[PDB]
Paper text:
Here, we solved the crystal structure of the non-myristoylated engineered Arf1 mutant, [L8K]Arf1, bound to a GDP analogue (G3D). This mutant was previously generated to remove the requirement for a membrane surface for GTP/GDP exchange. There is only a single monomer of [L8K]Arf1 in the crystal asymmetric unit, with residues 6–180 visible in the structure; in addition to residues 2–5, part of switch II (residues 70–74) was too disordered to be modeled. The macromolecule is clearly bound to a magnesium ion as well as a guanine nucleotide that was initially thought to be GDP, but was later determined to be G3D, a GDP molecule with a phosphate in the 3’ position. The most striking difference between the WT and [L8K] structures is in the positioning of their N-terminal residues; while both structures exhibit amphipathic helices that occlude the hydrophobic cavity where the myristoyl group is typically found in the native protein (see next section), the helices are offset by 6.5 Å (L8Cα to K8Cα). Further, the hinge region between the N-terminal helix and β1 is approximately 7.1 Å (K16Cα-Cα) more extended in the WT structure than in the [L8K] structure. Another difference between the structures is the interswitch region, which in the [L8K] structure moves approximately 2.4 Å (based on averaged Cα-Cα distances of K59 and N60) towards the cavity compared to the WT structure. Examination of the location of the L8K mutation revealed that this residue, while located inside the hydrophobic cavity in the non-myristoylated WT structure as L8, is instead found outside of the hydrophobic cavity when mutated to lysine. Interestingly, the N-terminal shift as a result of the L8K mutation is also achieved by redundancies in the N-terminal sequence of Arf1—while the hydrophobic cavity in the WT structure is filled by residues F5, L8, F9, L12, and partly M18, the cavity in the [L8K] structure is instead filled by F9, L12, F13, and M18 to a greater degree. The crystal structure of non-myristoylated [L8K]Arf1•G3D extends our understanding of the N-terminus of Arf in that we find that the single residue mutation significantly changes the mechanism of binding.
Residue numbers in the entry: 6 to 69, 75 to 180
């Protein structure tokens, strides 16, 4: 029994999940067990991973283009995954997140931040990640931060349940 397959209602739901390389995004995709990850290379050096099961679709790429903006406009949910143990690159994660949120095509996207790798000893917790990313500053933005360990699965249901509920009841 796959807990994610009935988590997104029955209407079309499109989610874009991005983040710096090594944040844990591909790990999350596999954990959903929603089918084969299809990799496309729309242009050399731009790798896109897609998972689709019935009404739910995840699109994934690393950050850090015209095609990006066409992916944006159809995006209802935006997930930003961050390596909570990588203090050296947390500011870079912030700048990439803020760059995406400045895009008009994502103006109405609901934002879920996965503060990933919470299993590691010296990982910043979700409150610290919230402050380092400046999420309290966000304007006209429906956002949530969820502590996760993608390799164990902890937190993934909780975050996606929050996001799905927001998308289905608004
Ligand atoms: N400790 C820990 N590691 C995690 C967690 N999530 C992902 N990882 C690990 O981090 C590395 C990068 O994950 P990946 O999903 O490839 O990230 P990406 O797709 O965002 O680039 C992988 O290890 P490798 O590259 O070494 O195989 C993966 O196993 C987590 O919650 N905790
Ligand atoms: Mg990857």
């Amino acid at each position: 029994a796959n807990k994610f397959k009935g988590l997104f209602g029955k209407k079309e739901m499109r989610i874009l999940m991005v983040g710096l390389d090594a944040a844990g995004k591909t790990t999350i995709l596999y954990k959903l067990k929603l089918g084969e990850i299809v990799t496309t290379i729309p242009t050399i050096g731009f790798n896109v991973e897609t998972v689709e099961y019935k009404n739910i679709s995840f699109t994934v790429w690393d950050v850090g283009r015209p095609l990006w903006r066409h992916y944006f406009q159809n995006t209802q949910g935006l997930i930003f995954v961050v390596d909570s143990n990588d203090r050296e690159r947390v500011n870079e994660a912030r700048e990439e997140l803020m760059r995406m949120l400045a895009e008009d095509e994502l103006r109405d996207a609901v934002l879920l931040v996965f503060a990933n790798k919470q299993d590691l000893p010296n990982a910043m917790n979700a409150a610290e990640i919230t402050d380092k990313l400046g999420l309290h500053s966000l304007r006209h933005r429906n956002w949530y931060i969820q502590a996760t360990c993608a390799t164990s699965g902890d937190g993934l249901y909780e975050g996606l349940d929050w996001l799905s509920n927001q998308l289905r009841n608004q």
